[PDB]
């Protein structure tokens, strides 16, 4: 059943060749979002895996992360805290930076939404280089949150996200894995 | 369901949404609802009970706060969730529509199909420009939308009337005065 749900999940994700630019494969989770079965099972499986873990908040990073972290928060019956692109959160924020191809950008979190003692699970769609999750984890930790787990629908191991998270004291968990080739 | 439990839940949902002066306008901040598990599950439970008889086959939410309410409702109804996004983020074939500030929204063309009864779900009806565009995207692909659903309605900004003279039933959990 679990093994079968995973294959059903993996086949609902479409692979787009030469996106964004040529010789690059893109895994489109939106084909999963429109398959009611695959989408519920993905949230069931992420929830169940963290039932025994004592999580008090889930953090998801804008925007595809919203689609997995928020339903996981709902299933665990805990609060959801969003990490956002700059200038969207209205209350007091802190900021972290992360690298893009051509520059740098920032993520923000509300300072009142995390505090000492919170046990935080990060949920996201995609572990690629891991730069956004690294920035997200530093946000959570600067506010005294404890983060040991990050959960992903898709893992791209050839980009070495996993070991970069391990270096930062995060154990990663993922549903499916895809090759870069 | 009891109409008086319902009224109690709606009040608790309204009391958990915080208010911010002169950001960005009176800013109504839905992030306080998001971090309150009881207010948040209750807002999803309410929206989705409202539409469980309606024969919905798809839920559409707009990036990014729309994702936070539209996807859980999709999940609660057992139907597909379809995101309407900012430019350049959707990977398959898209069509595009314009709304003012001006910018575009996009949706995958293979995700709406004629026959679809689509509920749009969003966090907040302000001026209603995103929703106008989102309905056009859907209608152009042969979907029926008659139904748009909101946590928060801000009528003084005029959203509700702008939706009417486009074909659309508005439903909001709560509203506030400007
Ligand atoms: Na804090
Ligand atoms: Na179509």
Short mmCIF file of C-alpha atoms and ligand atoms in Angstrom, two decimals:
data_model
loop_
_atom_site.label_atom_id
_atom_site.label_comp_id
_atom_site.label_asym_id
_atom_site.label_seq_id
_atom_site.Cartn_x
_atom_site.Cartn_y
_atom_site.Cartn_z
CA UNK A 1 0.00 0.00 0.00
CA UNK A 2 2.65 2.58 1.13
CA UNK A 3 5.11 1.39 -1.55
CA UNK A 4 2.18 1.54 -4.07
CA UNK A 5 1.05 5.07 -2.98
CA UNK A 6 4.64 6.30 -3.60
CA UNK A 7 4.72 5.01 -7.21
CA UNK A 8 1.29 6.52 -7.79
CA UNK A 9 2.73 9.79 -6.35
CA UNK A 10 5.90 9.62 -8.49
CA UNK A 11 3.84 9.02 -11.77
CA UNK A 12 1.54 11.87 -11.07
CA UNK A 13 4.55 14.26 -11.23
CA UNK A 14 5.26 15.23 -14.84
CA UNK A 15 8.69 15.81 -16.21
CA UNK A 16 9.07 18.85 -18.47
CA UNK A 17 12.22 18.75 -20.80
CA UNK A 18 14.14 21.99 -21.60
CA UNK A 19 12.44 23.99 -18.89
CA UNK A 20 13.25 26.68 -17.89
CA UNK A 21 16.20 26.66 -20.35
CA UNK A 22 17.40 23.81 -22.63
CA UNK A 23 18.96 20.48 -21.41
CA UNK A 24 17.24 21.03 -18.02
CA UNK A 25 14.56 18.69 -16.70
CA UNK A 26 11.81 20.21 -14.52
CA UNK A 27 9.50 18.12 -12.30
CA UNK A 28 6.06 19.66 -12.21
CA UNK A 29 4.21 19.06 -8.98
CA UNK A 30 1.14 20.75 -10.29
CA UNK A 31 0.14 17.49 -12.03
CA UNK A 32 0.06 16.02 -8.52
CA UNK A 33 -1.99 18.91 -7.11
CA UNK A 34 -4.77 18.14 -9.66
CA UNK A 35 -4.83 14.46 -8.89
CA UNK A 36 -6.96 14.27 -5.70
CA UNK A 37 -5.64 10.79 -4.84
CA UNK A 38 -1.93 11.53 -5.26
CA UNK A 39 -2.19 14.87 -3.38
CA UNK A 40 -4.05 13.43 -0.35
CA UNK A 41 -1.69 10.50 -0.12
CA UNK A 42 1.36 12.87 -0.21
CA UNK A 43 -0.07 14.84 2.77
CA UNK A 44 -1.18 11.62 4.57
CA UNK A 45 2.35 10.22 4.15
CA UNK A 46 4.20 13.34 5.31
CA UNK A 47 1.82 13.78 8.33
CA UNK A 48 2.06 10.12 9.49
CA UNK A 49 5.86 10.19 9.30
CA UNK A 50 5.95 13.10 11.86
CA UNK A 51 3.09 12.05 14.19
CA UNK A 52 5.49 10.67 16.84
CA UNK A 53 7.80 13.71 16.72
CA UNK A 54 6.29 16.43 18.98
CA UNK A 55 6.07 19.20 16.33
CA UNK A 56 4.43 22.46 17.50
CA UNK A 57 4.75 24.54 14.19
CA UNK A 58 5.13 23.81 10.52
CA UNK A 59 6.97 26.29 8.32
CA UNK A 60 6.53 26.45 4.56
CA UNK A 61 8.28 28.81 2.18
CA UNK A 62 6.53 30.81 -0.51
CA UNK A 63 4.88 29.65 -2.76
CA UNK A 64 4.88 25.97 -3.65
CA UNK A 65 5.88 25.21 -0.13
CA UNK A 66 2.56 26.61 1.03
CA UNK A 67 0.83 23.74 -0.78
CA UNK A 68 2.50 21.06 1.29
CA UNK A 69 3.39 22.64 4.56
CA UNK A 70 -0.07 24.10 5.21
CA UNK A 71 -1.99 20.85 4.70
CA UNK A 72 0.61 19.06 6.87
CA UNK A 73 0.08 21.68 9.62
CA UNK A 74 -3.69 21.05 9.32
CA UNK A 75 -3.24 17.27 9.53
CA UNK A 76 -0.95 17.53 12.59
CA UNK A 77 -3.29 20.06 14.16
CA UNK A 78 -0.50 22.57 14.70
CA UNK A 79 0.11 26.12 13.55
CA UNK A 80 1.38 27.09 10.11
CA UNK A 81 3.98 29.80 9.75
CA UNK A 82 4.90 31.11 6.28
CA UNK A 83 8.31 32.24 5.18
CA UNK A 84 7.92 34.87 2.48
CA UNK A 85 9.55 36.79 -0.37
CA UNK A 86 10.35 40.34 0.78
CA UNK A 87 7.66 42.94 1.46
CA UNK A 88 4.62 40.62 1.89
CA UNK A 89 4.55 40.02 5.67
CA UNK A 90 2.84 43.04 7.45
CA UNK A 91 4.19 42.61 10.97
CA UNK A 92 7.74 42.71 12.31
CA UNK A 93 10.11 40.50 10.34
CA UNK A 94 13.62 39.19 10.27
CA UNK A 95 15.51 38.52 6.95
CA UNK A 96 17.94 35.91 5.50
CA UNK A 97 19.67 35.86 2.11
CA UNK A 98 20.19 33.01 -0.39
CA UNK A 99 21.88 32.64 -3.85
CA UNK A 100 20.23 32.60 -7.30
CA UNK A 101 21.96 32.13 -10.63
CA UNK A 102 22.31 35.85 -11.23
CA UNK A 103 22.07 37.29 -7.81
CA UNK A 104 20.85 37.12 -4.33
CA UNK A 105 17.38 37.25 -2.78
CA UNK A 106 15.81 37.20 0.73
CA UNK A 107 13.28 35.37 2.77
CA UNK A 108 11.41 36.79 5.74
CA UNK A 109 9.63 35.44 8.80
CA UNK A 110 7.36 37.11 11.40
CA UNK A 111 9.32 37.44 14.68
CA UNK A 112 6.21 36.85 16.80
CA UNK A 113 5.46 33.49 15.02
CA UNK A 114 8.42 31.50 16.41
CA UNK A 115 9.81 31.45 19.95
CA UNK A 116 12.00 29.39 22.34
CA UNK A 117 10.64 25.88 22.80
CA UNK A 118 8.83 25.70 19.44
CA UNK A 119 9.63 22.42 17.66
CA UNK A 120 9.48 23.25 13.93
CA UNK A 121 9.09 20.91 10.96
CA UNK A 122 9.88 22.53 7.57
CA UNK A 123 7.83 21.17 4.68
CA UNK A 124 8.60 22.01 1.08
CA UNK A 125 7.92 20.68 -2.44
CA UNK A 126 11.47 20.32 -3.73
CA UNK A 127 14.98 19.80 -2.34
CA UNK A 128 17.33 21.06 -5.15
CA UNK A 129 20.46 23.05 -3.97
CA UNK A 130 18.88 23.65 -0.59
CA UNK A 131 19.63 27.35 -0.41
CA UNK A 132 16.09 28.48 0.43
CA UNK A 133 15.68 25.85 3.15
CA UNK A 134 19.04 26.85 4.62
CA UNK A 135 17.88 30.42 4.75
CA UNK A 136 14.47 29.28 6.22
CA UNK A 137 16.15 27.21 8.96
CA UNK A 138 18.35 30.15 9.98
CA UNK A 139 15.23 32.28 10.32
CA UNK A 140 13.54 29.71 12.53
CA UNK A 141 16.70 29.24 14.70
CA UNK A 142 17.37 33.00 15.14
CA UNK A 143 13.98 33.11 16.90
CA UNK A 144 14.87 30.15 19.24
CA UNK A 145 12.92 27.54 17.27
CA UNK A 146 14.37 24.06 17.20
CA UNK A 147 14.52 22.54 13.79
CA UNK A 148 15.79 19.09 13.12
CA UNK A 149 13.59 17.88 10.23
CA UNK A 150 12.84 19.04 6.68
CA UNK A 151 10.38 17.13 4.57
CA UNK A 152 10.06 17.18 0.79
CA UNK A 153 7.80 15.83 -1.88
CA UNK A 154 10.66 15.80 -4.39
CA UNK A 155 14.35 15.17 -3.74
CA UNK A 156 17.05 15.92 -6.40
CA UNK A 157 20.08 14.13 -4.91
CA UNK A 158 22.55 14.96 -7.70
CA UNK A 159 22.35 18.64 -6.49
CA UNK A 160 23.67 17.59 -3.02
CA UNK A 161 20.86 19.26 -1.01
CA UNK A 162 20.83 16.32 1.42
CA UNK A 163 24.46 16.65 2.62
CA UNK A 164 24.29 20.40 2.80
CA UNK A 165 21.29 20.03 5.13
CA UNK A 166 23.10 17.28 7.16
CA UNK A 167 25.99 19.84 7.60
CA UNK A 168 23.54 22.22 9.14
CA UNK A 169 22.07 19.57 11.56
CA UNK A 170 18.94 18.87 9.49
CA UNK A 171 17.83 15.32 8.60
CA UNK A 172 16.00 15.39 5.32
CA UNK A 173 13.03 13.25 4.32
CA UNK A 174 11.50 12.84 0.90
CA UNK A 175 8.77 11.00 -0.90
CA UNK A 176 10.21 10.53 -4.32
CA UNK A 177 13.60 11.17 -5.94
CA UNK A 178 14.40 12.12 -9.52
CA UNK A 179 17.74 12.20 -11.41
CA UNK A 180 18.90 15.50 -12.98
CA UNK A 181 19.34 13.50 -16.31
CA UNK B 1 -24.39 21.76 12.15
CA UNK B 2 -26.09 24.32 14.44
CA UNK B 3 -26.43 27.89 13.25
CA UNK B 4 -25.27 29.04 16.64
CA UNK B 5 -22.05 26.82 16.67
CA UNK B 6 -21.40 28.20 13.22
CA UNK B 7 -21.79 31.80 14.46
CA UNK B 8 -19.39 30.94 17.33
CA UNK B 9 -16.79 29.44 15.00
CA UNK B 10 -17.06 32.51 12.65
CA UNK B 11 -16.61 34.87 15.57
CA UNK B 12 -13.51 32.94 16.77
CA UNK B 13 -12.11 33.07 13.21
CA UNK B 14 -12.76 36.83 13.03
CA UNK B 15 -11.11 37.46 16.45
CA UNK B 16 -7.93 35.60 15.43
CA UNK B 17 -7.30 37.78 12.32
CA UNK B 18 -5.03 40.70 13.41
CA UNK B 19 -5.30 44.34 12.32
CA UNK B 20 -2.36 46.46 11.08
CA UNK B 21 -2.59 50.37 10.75
CA UNK B 22 -1.30 52.15 7.50
CA UNK B 23 0.47 49.07 6.16
CA UNK B 24 0.32 48.87 2.96
CA UNK B 25 -5.38 51.15 4.12
CA UNK B 26 -6.28 49.09 7.30
CA UNK B 27 -4.40 45.77 6.83
CA UNK B 28 -6.21 42.68 7.87
CA UNK B 29 -3.50 40.01 8.58
CA UNK B 30 -4.55 36.40 7.93
CA UNK B 31 -1.20 35.04 9.24
CA UNK B 32 -2.53 35.13 12.79
CA UNK B 33 -5.36 32.79 11.71
CA UNK B 34 -2.78 30.46 10.00
CA UNK B 35 -0.85 29.96 13.26
CA UNK B 36 -4.00 29.26 15.33
CA UNK B 37 -4.81 25.55 14.52
CA UNK B 38 -8.41 25.84 15.65
CA UNK B 39 -9.23 29.04 13.73
CA UNK B 40 -7.42 27.67 10.64
CA UNK B 41 -9.02 24.13 10.57
CA UNK B 42 -12.34 25.75 11.29
CA UNK B 43 -12.07 28.15 8.34
CA UNK B 44 -11.32 25.25 6.03
CA UNK B 45 -14.09 23.09 7.51
CA UNK B 46 -16.63 25.97 7.06
CA UNK B 47 -15.64 26.86 3.48
CA UNK B 48 -15.68 23.32 2.36
CA UNK B 49 -19.01 22.28 4.03
CA UNK B 50 -20.57 25.30 2.27
CA UNK B 51 -19.73 23.62 -1.12
CA UNK B 52 -19.80 19.83 -0.54
CA UNK B 53 -23.17 19.45 -2.37
CA UNK B 54 -22.30 21.86 -5.14
CA UNK B 55 -20.74 19.23 -7.54
CA UNK B 56 -17.34 21.05 -7.63
CA UNK B 57 -14.69 19.20 -9.70
CA UNK B 58 -11.74 21.63 -9.26
CA UNK B 59 -10.58 24.28 -6.85
CA UNK B 60 -8.49 27.22 -8.08
CA UNK B 61 -6.36 29.40 -5.87
CA UNK B 62 -4.13 32.35 -6.77
CA UNK B 63 -0.63 32.63 -5.68
CA UNK B 64 0.31 32.95 -2.85
CA UNK B 65 -2.04 33.49 0.06
CA UNK B 66 -4.83 31.88 -2.04
CA UNK B 67 -2.82 28.64 -1.90
CA UNK B 68 -3.28 28.49 1.92
CA UNK B 69 -7.07 28.23 1.76
CA UNK B 70 -7.76 26.89 -1.73
CA UNK B 71 -5.61 23.77 -1.46
CA UNK B 72 -6.87 22.60 1.93
CA UNK B 73 -10.44 23.05 0.64
CA UNK B 74 -9.59 21.03 -2.46
CA UNK B 75 -8.26 18.35 -0.14
CA UNK B 76 -11.35 18.47 2.09
CA UNK B 77 -13.66 18.20 -1.02
CA UNK B 78 -11.51 15.44 -2.63
CA UNK B 79 -11.07 17.35 -5.93
CA UNK B 80 -8.05 18.68 -7.90
CA UNK B 81 -6.31 21.82 -6.94
CA UNK B 82 -5.24 24.15 -9.71
CA UNK B 83 -2.94 27.16 -9.02
CA UNK B 84 -3.17 30.43 -10.85
CA UNK B 85 0.29 31.94 -10.78
CA UNK B 86 2.43 34.99 -11.32
CA UNK B 87 4.20 34.99 -14.79
CA UNK B 88 7.04 32.66 -15.56
CA UNK B 89 6.40 30.02 -12.87
CA UNK B 90 4.04 27.55 -14.56
CA UNK B 91 6.02 25.02 -16.76
CA UNK B 92 3.41 23.63 -19.22
CA UNK B 93 1.25 25.53 -21.77
CA UNK B 94 -0.46 28.47 -20.13
CA UNK B 95 -2.83 31.22 -21.06
CA UNK B 96 -2.61 34.60 -19.39
CA UNK B 97 -4.89 37.40 -18.23
CA UNK B 98 -4.22 41.03 -17.15
CA UNK B 99 -5.21 42.78 -13.96
CA UNK B 100 -4.12 46.25 -12.71
CA UNK B 101 -1.59 47.77 -10.16
CA UNK B 102 -0.53 46.30 -14.38
CA UNK B 103 0.43 42.54 -14.27
CA UNK B 104 -0.69 39.08 -15.56
CA UNK B 105 -1.88 35.79 -14.05
CA UNK B 106 -1.40 32.38 -15.69
CA UNK B 107 -2.98 28.96 -15.49
CA UNK B 108 -2.19 25.67 -17.14
CA UNK B 109 -4.45 25.04 -20.25
CA UNK B 110 -4.48 21.25 -19.67
CA UNK B 111 -5.85 21.79 -16.05
CA UNK B 112 -9.25 23.18 -16.87
CA UNK B 113 -11.52 21.22 -19.08
CA UNK B 114 -15.04 21.90 -20.36
CA UNK B 115 -17.44 20.28 -17.91
CA UNK B 116 -15.47 21.53 -14.92
CA UNK B 117 -17.33 23.18 -12.14
CA UNK B 118 -14.66 25.32 -10.48
CA UNK B 119 -14.68 26.99 -7.15
CA UNK B 120 -12.24 29.86 -6.68
CA UNK B 121 -11.00 30.20 -3.11
CA UNK B 122 -8.96 33.05 -1.84
CA UNK B 123 -7.95 34.72 1.33
CA UNK B 124 -9.42 38.21 0.79
CA UNK B 125 -11.75 40.19 -1.37
CA UNK B 126 -10.24 43.66 -1.54
CA UNK B 127 -10.67 45.43 -4.98
CA UNK B 128 -11.17 42.09 -6.77
CA UNK B 129 -8.83 42.46 -9.70
CA UNK B 130 -7.04 39.11 -9.22
CA UNK B 131 -10.33 37.30 -9.00
CA UNK B 132 -11.75 39.00 -12.12
CA UNK B 133 -8.72 37.77 -14.10
CA UNK B 134 -8.80 34.29 -12.54
CA UNK B 135 -12.40 33.82 -13.66
CA UNK B 136 -11.56 34.81 -17.22
CA UNK B 137 -8.72 32.28 -17.29
CA UNK B 138 -11.10 29.53 -16.24
CA UNK B 139 -13.98 30.51 -18.48
CA UNK B 140 -11.64 30.68 -21.53
CA UNK B 141 -10.73 26.98 -21.00
CA UNK B 142 -14.38 25.98 -20.89
CA UNK B 143 -14.78 25.71 -17.13
CA UNK B 144 -17.81 27.00 -15.32
CA UNK B 145 -17.10 29.29 -12.38
CA UNK B 146 -20.07 30.75 -10.52
CA UNK B 147 -18.53 30.53 -7.07
CA UNK B 148 -15.79 32.50 -5.36
CA UNK B 149 -15.03 32.01 -1.65
CA UNK B 150 -13.07 34.23 0.78
CA UNK B 151 -11.91 34.20 4.32
CA UNK B 152 -12.13 37.97 4.46
CA UNK B 153 -14.35 40.45 2.63
CA UNK B 154 -13.48 44.21 2.62
CA UNK B 155 -16.62 45.80 1.01
CA UNK B 156 -15.67 49.51 1.32
CA UNK B 157 -12.91 48.72 -1.30
CA UNK B 158 -15.76 47.65 -3.66
CA UNK B 159 -14.77 44.07 -4.56
CA UNK B 160 -18.25 42.54 -4.13
CA UNK B 161 -19.97 44.77 -6.69
CA UNK B 162 -17.08 44.37 -9.14
CA UNK B 163 -17.64 40.59 -8.95
CA UNK B 164 -21.37 40.78 -9.52
CA UNK B 165 -21.11 42.62 -12.89
CA UNK B 166 -18.81 39.73 -13.98
CA UNK B 167 -21.23 36.72 -13.16
CA UNK B 168 -19.86 35.60 -9.67
CA UNK B 169 -21.53 34.59 -6.24
CA UNK B 170 -19.23 35.84 -3.40
CA UNK B 171 -19.11 34.03 -0.05
CA UNK B 172 -17.04 35.30 2.85
CA UNK B 173 -16.43 33.94 6.36
CA UNK B 174 -15.97 37.46 7.83
CA UNK B 175 -15.87 41.06 6.85
CA UNK B 176 -14.45 44.28 8.21
CA UNK B 177 -15.08 48.02 7.82
CA UNK B 178 -12.36 50.25 6.28
NA1 LIG C 1 9.47 35.30 18.69
NA1 LIG C 2 -8.16 22.62 -21.36
#
